[PDB]
Amino acid sequence: EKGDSNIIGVWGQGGVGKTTLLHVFNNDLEKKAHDYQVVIFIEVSNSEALNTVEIQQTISERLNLPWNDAEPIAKRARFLIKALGRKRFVILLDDVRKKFCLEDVGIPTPDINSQSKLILTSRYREVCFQMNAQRSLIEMQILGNDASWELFLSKLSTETSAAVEPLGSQSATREHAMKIAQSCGGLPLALNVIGTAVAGLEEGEWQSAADAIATNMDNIDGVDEMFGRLKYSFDRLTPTQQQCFLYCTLFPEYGSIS
Amino acid sequence: KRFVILLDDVRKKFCLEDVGIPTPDINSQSKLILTSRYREVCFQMNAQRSLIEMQILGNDASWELFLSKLSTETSAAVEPLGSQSA
Amino acid sequence: KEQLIGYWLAEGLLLNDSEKGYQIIRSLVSACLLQVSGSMSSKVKMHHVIRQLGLWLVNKSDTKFLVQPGMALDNAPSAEEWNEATRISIMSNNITELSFSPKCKNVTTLLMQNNPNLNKMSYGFFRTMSSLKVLDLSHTAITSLPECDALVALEHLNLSHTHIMRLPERLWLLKELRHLDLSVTVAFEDTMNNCSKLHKLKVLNLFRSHYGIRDVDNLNLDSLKELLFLGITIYAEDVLKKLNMPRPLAKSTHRLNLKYCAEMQSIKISDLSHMEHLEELYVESCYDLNTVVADAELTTSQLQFLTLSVLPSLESVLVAPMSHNFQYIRKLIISHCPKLSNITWVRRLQLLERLVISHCDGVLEIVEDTGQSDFPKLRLIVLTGLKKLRSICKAREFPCLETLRVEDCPNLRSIPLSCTHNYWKLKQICGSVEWWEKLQWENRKEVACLDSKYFIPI
């Protein structure tokens, strides 16, 4: 609302709620009154080759336009640029990964003279800077300890939760849950994966599971897909940069390096 | 629409919105029922707290079901009570 | 789970991490391949259909099995079937004599537990067993183990409840050995000064053994720095004092046994406070035992199993009421303590489940004269021969009670059982009819319902 720049960029670690934030924001826009006629949600992360046809189809569907199959891409881009030129639109790009011309797909770059706002998210600050959104940038901070704990219970069965939830009486299971929740580091996707994998605890093995999870995260279920989802950010770097990144892991856990 | 969808024997986690099924919320009256051979996949469906374990049938139920799959020429050779036979 | 994870660790299927074994068990139970079943969650079982499916998969697999457990086999199968398989199991059988020498090069695991009639084996049985990794001879009546110098890959041994007399020196030639279990050895006499020969050992066990570390001279485990868990049976105070200096060896005593102890008139958990891993404590036949001290010092160790046996001189155990190390106690067994007359502190054990008492003719009540019942998780109480047990305790909530057995308790007039509690988990109650009639009940429904639903007369 207050922002003087029509392009808003959000960046953060993979799976820290960027897509979730866009979903909740888009759903909450219907509560408030606004002058924006159309709100468009676009998922660009479908490919790193900029699959333009899907984006054009989504925009055309959102504007009640008659989609055509044989129309050339450039002519459609001009047609949508003219179409979006008379409407105050809110387009929500999700997880953009490489710089791409907005006019190429058909999205007109909003200017101060127009009331349209553009919101995009990314895993990289550099690509957000490439979108002329260097001054609507917000870093997605990880969730707090209280938020992480309350989210952790939502992914546990009560036969386990009623074994951990109660206060007053102190049991080792609650402290083990403290270790596990803090080990996930407040990253919501990591909390979801671990909590789903740890929804089935009974009392006996709470100690050993907490002991091992603090050291080796491979053995707990569901982590392979989590790493695969987070694997891409490493893969984008050059082999020299990759070797530099893996050299940083040798420093002690929860430390600080100059 | 207030819908009741019955998934049968789900085996891997999959997004409900991907197929077109909206994830029901407390604000809606729709109920989703799914079955699986694995507790983990059921936990992955945010159904960790509507979980029921399918207990095997009891001895009496197993016996009464067993007769239903036998011919009487065999059943009348086993069914009668009172007289004890091997 | 502890046995199965141990065999998995010895087999090499696990990277020296037991928690991954717990994870695999979780994957199996979550897939309904296995089902947890037992008094505690520590025991699981396999369904009959799943067992048959596993046998069928073995038959379809290249790795043939020769598994004949629990069919009461009186004569072991000929060596022809053994020579090709990879895993053999003949547990829970009635095998008497074993004569053939197998030619099993590919066999890696053997299971010959629960064989009361098995007492003798042919010499040279182990020569062809180059690939063996897991070996068990528990719950048998053998006295000696034949030559096993050809076992270049064994890691696990378990001779629990076995009347072994002397360990052959061939074991010290095995540098790959990892686990030894020698509990409940009533005929054991070999010295443990020879254990220093091995270097890569992880676990020992001398719990409830006829011969243990009787003096400081026998204590030479400092050489084995690879050990993580040890079982030790103490016979004199000097062993405990020598164990009472700060070193990783001292803190590794997870479970402790006291048998035929001399000059052990008193014992303090402060003397045991150097041990952070201690859970189980067994005391049997110590003449000196006069008093036991349970200090308020909350040692990180969480004792869960306590058993006191044959202590005519044991007067009392002092337990701090506000905060004590016994708050983690899972089970109590007190046997033959005629002078023990102060056990009221049991009411402070909120995590107590199983009770067995026998011939402790000095105890008036287990509890004599937080906003919760003292025993909410209580499951089992056993009393036998208690001549001077006037009562058990005051009425308390036992929602999880399942089994109760009391015999030969003439002074036992009342029990904390009452109809005000909910009854849906109880399954069986044992005891003599005369004692049941002699009991005094606050409500007659406590008599009719119990005697008609779950009372099992002897």
Ligand SMILES: Nc1ncnc2c1ncn2[C@@H]1O[C@H](COP(=O)(O)OP(=O)(O)OP(=O)(O)O)[C@@H](O)[C@H]1O
């Ligand atoms: N505040 C939150 N509460 C509950 N779940 C959350 C929250 N934030 C994120 N999540 C979970 O995070 C999961 C992954 O989506 P998320 O929005 O975190 O990804 P992302 O940051 O867009 O990832 P990527 O960088 O891969 O595009 C979702 O399944 C969602 O349930």
